[PDB]
Amino acid sequence: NMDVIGERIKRIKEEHNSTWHYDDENPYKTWAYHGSYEVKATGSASSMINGVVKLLTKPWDVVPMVTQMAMTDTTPFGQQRVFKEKVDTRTPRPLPGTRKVMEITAEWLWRTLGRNKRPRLCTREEFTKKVRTNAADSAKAAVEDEEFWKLVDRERELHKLGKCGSCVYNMSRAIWYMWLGVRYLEFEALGFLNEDHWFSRENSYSGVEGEGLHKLGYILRDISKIPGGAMYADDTAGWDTRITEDDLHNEEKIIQQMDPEHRQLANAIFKLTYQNKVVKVQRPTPTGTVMDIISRKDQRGSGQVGTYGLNTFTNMEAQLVRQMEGEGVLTKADLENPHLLEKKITQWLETKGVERLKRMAISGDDCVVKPIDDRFANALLALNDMGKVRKDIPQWQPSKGWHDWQQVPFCSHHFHELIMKDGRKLVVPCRPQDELIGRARISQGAGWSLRETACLGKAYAQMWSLMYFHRRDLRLASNAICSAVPVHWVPTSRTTWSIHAHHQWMTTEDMLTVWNRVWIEENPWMEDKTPVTTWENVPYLGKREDQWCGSLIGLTSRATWAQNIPTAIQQVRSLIGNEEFLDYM
Numbered sequence: 001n002m003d004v005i006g007e008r009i010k011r012i013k014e015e016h017n018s019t020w021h022y023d024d025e026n027p028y029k030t031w032a033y034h035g036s037y038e039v040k041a042t043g044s045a046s047s048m049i050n051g052v053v054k055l056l057t058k059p060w061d062v063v064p065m066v067t068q069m070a071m072t073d074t075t076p077f078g079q080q081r082v083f084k085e086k087v088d089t090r091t092p093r094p095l096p097g098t099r100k101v102m103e104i105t106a107e108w109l110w111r112t113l114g115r116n117k118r119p120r121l122c123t124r125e126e127f128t129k130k131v132r133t134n135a136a137d138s139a140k141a142a143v144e145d146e147e148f149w150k151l152v153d154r155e156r157e158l159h160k161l162g163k164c165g166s167c168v169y170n171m172s173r174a175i176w177y178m179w180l181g182v183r184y185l186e187f188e189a190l191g192f193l194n195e196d197h198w199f200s201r202e203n204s205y206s207g208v209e210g211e212g213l214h215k216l217g218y219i220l221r222d223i224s225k226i227p228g229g230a231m232y233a234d235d236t237a238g239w240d241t242r243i244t245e246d247d248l249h250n251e252e253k254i255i256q257q258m259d260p261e262h263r264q265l266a267n268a269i270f271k272l273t274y275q276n277k278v279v280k281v282q283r284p285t286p287t288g289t290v291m292d293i294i295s296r297k298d299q300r301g302s303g304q305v306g307t308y309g310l311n312t313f314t315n316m317e318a319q320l321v322r323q324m325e326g327e328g329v330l331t332k333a334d335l336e337n338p339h340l341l342e343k344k345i346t347q348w349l350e351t352k353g354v355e356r357l358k359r360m361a362i363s364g365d366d367c368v369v370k371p372i373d374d375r376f377a378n379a380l381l382a383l384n385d386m387g388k389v390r391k392d393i394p395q396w397q398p399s400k401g402w403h404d405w406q407q408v409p410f411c412s413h414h415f416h417e418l419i420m421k422d423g424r425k426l427v428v429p430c431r432p433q434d435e436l437i438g439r440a441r442i443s444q445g446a447g448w449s450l451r452e453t454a455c456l457g458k459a460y461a462q463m464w465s466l467m468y469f470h471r472r473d474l475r476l477a478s479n480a481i482c483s484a485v486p487v488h489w490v491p492t493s494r495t496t497w498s499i500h501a502h503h504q505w506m507t508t509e510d511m512l513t514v515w516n517r518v519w520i521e522e523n524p525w526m527e528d529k530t531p532v533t534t535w536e537n538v539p540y541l542g543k544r545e546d547q548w549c550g551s552l553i554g555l556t557s558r559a560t561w562a563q564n565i566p567t568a569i570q571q572v573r574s575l576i577g578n579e580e581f582l583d584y585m
């Protein structure tokens with residue numbers, strides 16, 4: 001395997017020849033270990049607390065989930081722990097018949113996805129514009145430097161020769177240039193999947209790319225109208241670690257639809273950075289901290305450009321295979337059979353495939369499936385055999401589905417149908433409230449001024465106004481944060497990296513105006529475009545639902561907090577200084 005990965009290791013070895021060594025106490029069992037070199041410790045044992053959000057959410061100072069989120073270890077100790085538990089495993093190879101069905105389904109799926117769109121290369125200017133409209137950091141400085149682009153051209157020339165020299169995945173200025181350059185090249189060859197929305201619902205049927213969190217609930221409610229069995233939402237245990245060599249070969253089939261110049265570069269990403277990979281991971285030792293150089297031929301690199309799209313692809317494929325087994329199209333004998341008859345698989349795909357894709361909502365490893373009946377609950381032979389073993393359940397125990405789309409978990413949320421005072425219905429996203437408060441209380445990094453902290457707090461408050469306004473405690477805390485932070489201060493940083501986040505809260509525009517735009521004007525499931533003129537007409541969950549989902553409403557500590565909130569707002573204001581503030585209470 002050194003013929004593909006050798007050059008990359010050689011450059012790492014030569015760059016760190018001062019401290020390069022083969023550690024014999026290295027813990028890698030399924031990854032090939034190449035060597036180590038000394039580094040300085042990266043990450044922290046805990047996370048920095050947002051004092052603005054914390055001062056305005058006092059009742060949650062005594063909440064266990066809120067305290068757990070304040071932790072999260074990112075040190076070389078924390079890295080090694082998660083690695084041992086998840087990453088250092090081997091997925092048994094699927095059976096010959098399973099491999100055949102997967103190949104037939106992948107070919108059909110790629111042709112269906114490419115029926116209107118044609119693959120294309122992504123550019124230097126697209127990558128630049130994206131980096132620009134994100135930070136405005138060191139990534140924007142590299143994009144601005146012509147010497148970074150000349151390193152890109154040189155690595156590209158190697159890729160055209162079927163070689164790689166610096167595309168290394170990470171679990172001072174030269175190494176940063178090689179990392180960003182590796183990501184640019186991946187984006188150039190596979191970025192079209194994201195940039196041209198191959199996984200939009202109109203293009204993929206099952207996909208939800210570009211839809212946004214506030215649209216996911218409406219999609220689940222539309223799926224519920226399709227005749228069939230229950231709605232299933234099974235969680236795979238560590239999806240990225242279950243991506244097999246057979247999955248990678250099926251994913252690669254997209255190169256068949258590419259122009260010759262694009263195919264060569266995409267083939268280079270697939271063969272050299274997906275099907276072979278060189279990975280850097282930190283590790284503590286009695287001597288200090290080391291960086292290990294490891295490699296393998298399968299699994300998915302979590303941080304890559306193609307990750308979301310290719311996980312969505314393989315999960316759509318895997319769920320269609322499970323649907324076929326549920327329908328009796330695929331038997332136990334079929335999966336073991338190398339000479340499995342292609343005809344009934346092709347017939348099912350050509351006659352039912354698209355209708356079956358419409359019964360699903362698939363976002364990377366997250367899936368919701370409404371099969372034609374409940375035989376799907378016990379259709380586990382292919383799912384387990386493909387390596388997509390469900391999390392925290394015996395392997396052969398039937399899946400439990402839901403007969404109400406409002407109970408279905410999808411993308412860390414569930415969704416409620418609300419009735420507004422004017423009789424119109426809204427479908428809103430929701431999750432346990434402690435997870436929302438616990439996240440907002442976290443500031444990312446260190447050395448942040450009260451202004452930056454207050455502005456991130458404002459971002460969280462405004463996200464709650466737009467997505468979670470239906471939670472009494474979050475509307476109150478949101479109003480308190482926005483009252484404590486100067487009106488003209490622009491929310492900074494980000495509340496989430498989710499593909500489902502459109503960041504409509506990253507503004508100084510009136511939140512009720514933005515609310516109306518999102519939930520009324522631009523909402524395709526809102527036939528009546530009558531604007532809501534007051535927050536008084538913006539609904540809450542029913543009190544019992546709010547409580548079932550974590551509200552502290554009805555508690556004394558909460559009644560005391562609500563009563564005394566103008567005092568805490570005033571305290572934050574007095575520390576921020578002589579700025580313009582608006583009272584939202």
Ligand SMILES: COc1ccc(CC(=O)O)cc1-c1ccsc1
Nearest residue numbers: 213411412467496497498500501
């Ligand atoms: C499906 O949308 C999500 C999924 C998870 C998360 C949590 C996180 O990324 O910290 C946030 C969102 C989200 C998206 C728009 S507002 C909040």
Ligand SMILES: [Zn+2]
Nearest residue numbers: 164165166167
């Ligand atoms: Zn490379």
Ligand SMILES: [Zn+2]
Nearest residue numbers: 414430431549
């Ligand atoms: Zn809820």
